[PDB]
Amino acid sequence: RIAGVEIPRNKRVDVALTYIYGIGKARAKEALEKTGINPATRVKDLTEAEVVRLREYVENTWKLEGELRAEVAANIKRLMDIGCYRGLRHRRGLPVRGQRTRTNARTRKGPRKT
Amino acid sequence: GKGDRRTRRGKIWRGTYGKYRPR
Amino acid sequence: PRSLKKGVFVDDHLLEKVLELNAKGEKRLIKTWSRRSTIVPEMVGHTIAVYNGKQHVPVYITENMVGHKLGEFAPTRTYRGHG
Amino acid sequence: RIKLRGFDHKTLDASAQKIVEAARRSGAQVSGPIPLPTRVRRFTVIRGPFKHKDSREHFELRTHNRLVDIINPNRKTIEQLMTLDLPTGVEIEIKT
Amino acid sequence: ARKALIEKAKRTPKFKVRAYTRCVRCGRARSVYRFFGLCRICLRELAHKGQLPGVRKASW
Amino acid sequence: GNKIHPIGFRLGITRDWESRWYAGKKQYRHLLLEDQRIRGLLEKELYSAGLARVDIERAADNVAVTVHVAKPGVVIGRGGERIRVLREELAKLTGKNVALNVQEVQNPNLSAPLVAQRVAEQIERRFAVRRAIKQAVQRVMESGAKGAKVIVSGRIGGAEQARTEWAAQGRVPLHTLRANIDYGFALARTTYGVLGVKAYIFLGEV
Amino acid sequence: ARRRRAEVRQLQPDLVYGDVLVTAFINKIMRDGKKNLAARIFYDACKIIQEKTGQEPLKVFKQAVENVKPRMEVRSRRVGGANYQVPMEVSPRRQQSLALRWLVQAANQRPERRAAVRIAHELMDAAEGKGGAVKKKEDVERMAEANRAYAHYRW
Amino acid sequence: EQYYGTGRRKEAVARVFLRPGNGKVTVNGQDFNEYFQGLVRAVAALEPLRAVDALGHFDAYITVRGGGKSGQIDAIKLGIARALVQYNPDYRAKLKPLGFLTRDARVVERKKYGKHKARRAPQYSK
RNA sequence: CCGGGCACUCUAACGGGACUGCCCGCGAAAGCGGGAGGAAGGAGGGGACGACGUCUGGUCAGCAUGGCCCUUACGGCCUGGGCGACACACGUGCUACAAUGCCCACUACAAAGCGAUGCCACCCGGCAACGGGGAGCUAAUCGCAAAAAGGUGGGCCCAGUUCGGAUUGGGGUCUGCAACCCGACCCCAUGAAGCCGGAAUCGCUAGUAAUCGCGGAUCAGCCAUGCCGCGGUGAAUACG
Numbered sequence A: 001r002i003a004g005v006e007i008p009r010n011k012r013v014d015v016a017l018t019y020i021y022g023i024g025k026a027r028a029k030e031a032l033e034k035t036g037i038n039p040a041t042r043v044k045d046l047t048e049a050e051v052v053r054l055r056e057y058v059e060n061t062w063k064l065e066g067e068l069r070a071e072v073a074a075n076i077k078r079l080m081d082i083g084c085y086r087g088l089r090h091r092r093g094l095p096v097r098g099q100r101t102r103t104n105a106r107t108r109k110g111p112r113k114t
Numbered sequence B: 001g002k003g004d005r006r007t008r009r010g011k012i013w014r015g016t017y018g019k020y021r022p023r
Numbered sequence C: 001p002r003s004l005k006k007g008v009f010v011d012d013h014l015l016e017k018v019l020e021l022n023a024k025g026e027k028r029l030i031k032t033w034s035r036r037s038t039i040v041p042e043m044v045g046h047t048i049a050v051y052n053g054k055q056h057v058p059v060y061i062t063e064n065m066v067g068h069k070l071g072e073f074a075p076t077r078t079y080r081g082h083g
Numbered sequence D: 001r002i003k004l005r006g007f008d009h010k011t012l013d014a015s016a017q018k019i020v021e022a023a024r025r026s027g028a029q030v031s032g033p034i035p036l037p038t039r040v041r042r043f044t045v046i047r048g049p050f051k052h053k054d055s056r057e058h059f060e061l062r063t064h065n066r067l068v069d070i071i072n073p074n075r076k077t078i079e080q081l082m083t084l085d086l087p088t089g090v091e092i093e094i095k096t
Numbered sequence E: 001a002r003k004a005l006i007e008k009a010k011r012t013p014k015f016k017v018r019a020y021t022r023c024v025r026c027g028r029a030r031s032v033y034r035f036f037g038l039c040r041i042c043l044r045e046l047a048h049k050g051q052l053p054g055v056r057k058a059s060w
Numbered sequence F: 001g002n003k004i005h006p007i008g009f010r011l012g013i014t015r016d017w018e019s020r021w022y023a024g025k026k027q028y029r030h031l032l033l034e035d036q037r038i039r040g041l042l043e044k045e046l047y048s049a050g051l052a053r054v055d056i057e058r059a060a061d062n063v064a065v066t067v068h069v070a071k072p073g074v075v076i077g078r079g080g081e082r083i084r085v086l087r088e089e090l091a092k093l094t095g096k097n098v099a100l101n102v103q104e105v106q107n108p109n110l111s112a113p114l115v116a117q118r119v120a121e122q123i124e125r126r127f128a129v130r131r132a133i134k135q136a137v138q139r140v141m142e143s144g145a146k147g148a149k150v151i152v153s154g155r156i157g158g159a160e161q162a163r164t165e166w167a168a169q170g171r172v173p174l175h176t177l178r179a180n181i182d183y184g185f186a187l188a189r190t191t192y193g194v195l196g197v198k199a200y201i202f203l204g205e206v
Numbered sequence G: 001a002r003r004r005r006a007e008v009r010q011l012q013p014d015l016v017y018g019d020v021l022v023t024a025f026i027n028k029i030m031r032d033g034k035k036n037l038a039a040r041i042f043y044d045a046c047k048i049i050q051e052k053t054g055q056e057p058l059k060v061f062k063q064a065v066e067n068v069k070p071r072m073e074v075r076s077r078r079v080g081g082a083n084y085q086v087p088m089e090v091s092p093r094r095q096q097s098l099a100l101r102w103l104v105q106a107a108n109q110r111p112e113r114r115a116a117v118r119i120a121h122e123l124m125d126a127a128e129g130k131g132g133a134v135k136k137k138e139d140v141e142r143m144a145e146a147n148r149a150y151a152h153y154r155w
Numbered sequence H: 001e002q003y004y005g006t007g008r009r010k011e012a013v014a015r016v017f018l019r020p021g022n023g024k025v026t027v028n029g030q031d032f033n034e035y036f037q038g039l040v041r042a043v044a045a046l047e048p049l050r051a052v053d054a055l056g057h058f059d060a061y062i063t064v065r066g067g068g069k070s071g072q073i074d075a076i077k078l079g080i081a082r083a084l085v086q087y088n089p090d091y092r093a094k095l096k097p098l099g100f101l102t103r104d105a106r107v108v109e110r111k112k113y114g115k116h117k118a119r120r121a122p123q124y125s126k
Numbered sequence I: 001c002c003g004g005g006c007a008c009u010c011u012a013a014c015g016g017g018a019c020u021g022c023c024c025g026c027g028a029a030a031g032c033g034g035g036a037g038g039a040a041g042g043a044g045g046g047g048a049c050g051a052c053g054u055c056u057g058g059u060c061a062g063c064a065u066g067g068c069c070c071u072u073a074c075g076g077c078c079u080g081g082g083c084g085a086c087a088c089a090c091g092u093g094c095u096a097c098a099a100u101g102c103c104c105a106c107u108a109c110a111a112a113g114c115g116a117u118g119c120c121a122c123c124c125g126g127c128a129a130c131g132g133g134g135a136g137c138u139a140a141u142c143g144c145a146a147a148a149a150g151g152u153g154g155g156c157c158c159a160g161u162u163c164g165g166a167u168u169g170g171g172g173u174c175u176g177c178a179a180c181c182c183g184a185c186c187c188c189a190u191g192a193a194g195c196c197g198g199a200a201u202c203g204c205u206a207g208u209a210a211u212c213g214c215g216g217a218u219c220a221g222c223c224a225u226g227c228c229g230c231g232g233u234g235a236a237u238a239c240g
């Protein structure tokens, strides 16, 4: 379908685009504009010339699914290499952005270990 | 929800302005 | 982050020392109390014992640490787990 | 046009009523004593020096406002104007 | 270690940001009112003291 | 521990502020500061004379000062030396025109501070605390007071264990707002610590 | 509630039907003081029942309430090592509120997505003597009547 | 001719004016339904004019300030009750029994210190 | 908007007004129930107000204070780091888990405070944060400032969702001397758990709960979901 995945036909293209990893409401709200595509049309409600327009466009606008995940892990990979404090947090798998490490770090630490 | 910066309501509860809460 | 409208803050005396050893070539391992500065591309190839609160921790400056603060690579806290 | 600001209303009204007669003594217009809304500034605080955050105590500074204006300055009053009796809990503003 | 500290708060520092406000009366640092310069306690003492012009128990 | 200060409880109801002077945000904090130190400078400089009240009003660029005391002659000095001695020395501190005034304590057995002070100096001189209280409270009520109470807390009589002694007489309705009730506090410190002294003098429910 | 009996609040009769009881049912609908929201949701279901079985909705309403107004219920009583549930009568004050609370809850559980229809189906089946709210009233008094042996323990 | 009342209900002020006519309602230069569109409760403001039935008798020019529309509505119920008895004090009968002539003493209670709300004490665990 | 008026509201001072005042009945009375008027009725509501004392409660880290204790140091300065760690455990909060909802756009309606190196109108640039300009305001008049929920229309259509925003990558704005530990905010992307929660347990009886938003204190900044207030809507229930 599109760059990495398929959009849900019964859903409008707006949320469908955002289903692409590497695309939120913003780029979803924009690529339809640069491709002049009506967002209200469901994914099943999409013509080929529209999609190929949008497909080639968005696929040529931003790295979305795989290439994006490359740099993401890459950015954290390169962090872990230099040994920055941030890299320390990742290599420790602890809250990287100054969160209160003592409590409420389950999102970074997962299950509890009492 | 109210904790979403991207939501206008979030910036409302945040009491700020961004792309999604004009002034 | 520091506003790019504002200059890239770097502790001048430490920065100046780096520019000094540049003329004098890579040498004179620099102890620094100046955790807060950002590494400058000149600083690459140098080394610094960055002060950690009690100690000056030696850090070799590579290009992978140019756009960062000095103190980042000096972990001010020592953690080892529990038990 | 004259403002009056104090912490008492009586001293204001004492001051204001006195001044209101003053220009009334020898001139006009003596714009009536107009009570501006009293800017209050609350101050809350814990009663205890140490903790027990709960038990509080409220304080306030009702800077009571009053005002009068002079339509015709009536310089015979103007000397009377500058010849003023200002109690220690009152401040005054000038206009017309 | 307070007097020099409350004295140090008096002198001016190498950077304006270090300039903080202590109680003029008890030198306290926390709960210090810019409008008075007194701690929350010195205020309450002087409040009941009646030396605070206008100030009084605000009980609406 | 739990009761309210009687004076602040009655400001603007029956009792009046001790330093009446309007100020703005810009100058309230500064003019307050010298106002505080003026209370201290006159305090030591008039405690021997029996200071009662220090009313500090602020006219334009001159502090309307009023000191209530039982020893005006002790305040003024040798036919008015000390007054000038302080009226100048005061203005040296405040920097502005220190307008100093003295006011006697008519019936000093009703000045809750002075009644507190006098009890202090007695207990400052090892006198019988329990006795001095009653003798204190007595002439107070004997001086026409419509109700009087005195309390003292601390290491009563040098005992290593603290205690709160107190004697009262006549109606002392602390809750009555319109009950004119002069409060008097006396900090009486000993060789073995400090003793608190509080003077409650009900005069009239005006 | 030791000294007096804390007499009820005299509700304001509604604008549409002039009823307080309608106003009562609104309050059980109302959430977060959002009476404007809840008001429509009733008045919408007014239209709805006025469409499906077009009659007086209020005629549908009270008829619905009568089919769910309970009259006997249990009450817990741990006398001895056994907690009793004595069959008890119900005051009309509490008959409605219980019935009112019952219908709204069942209306909180129908599948239709908008509440106005859930209320719509609910009041209909309610006046039809059908639905869990009616079952709620059925189960209680049955449960109540099922334990009539504890009747004389009623206090 | 002109007839006046005042509306006060929980921080809502209502200036009501009764000029005889067909029952016009201008609320801040707006239609009643205009300024109260989508407001379920905002129909009973004329019910005092339905207590005494000069509905199509007096044209209602009214302004309101402060508080929500609902509070604005109650003040309207107050102001309508005023000029009526001012118009006809006999209207007090069939209003006092209807309670329109009494102001709602209810007001948002002061929020206490320690209490989250006027009575909302924080959940404590012993 | 103006002249024009103070009508009205409001502003802020003084008063009146509710006192079981009045009628019925009960009661020895006290009082009590009913009613009248009345805006308010029986403590009109809410505050401030905390008796003897109790807890050898808390505080020597606000302060003061006896005493003991150090004087090239336990004193003072600077620099930095810590107070922010973090397998864990508890308290108190916020956001939610959705359609009585969520998102978008337009349209309303407050109160209360704050503001001269501060509110900053308004304008421009900028996706925005914000930056460049820039008037008024020196305070009922200038601004903060939009109240928000609400109402209209649109979308979503039960979906881990257009729910959820946690985390994280990156790019920025501002303050600050300096935002690594350790700030906030904007933008992009990421889109965690979470489907109403065991044992248990909390608050609330009216404009209360609940919900929505607004201001101030500290403060340059803000780690504020806190605190103190302010207002919008606005309940159910009380047999006992």
Ligand SMILES: [Zn+2]
Pocket (backbone or CB within 6 Å): E023, E024, E025, E026, E027, E028, E038, E039, E040, E041, E042, E043
């Ligand atoms: Zn202080």
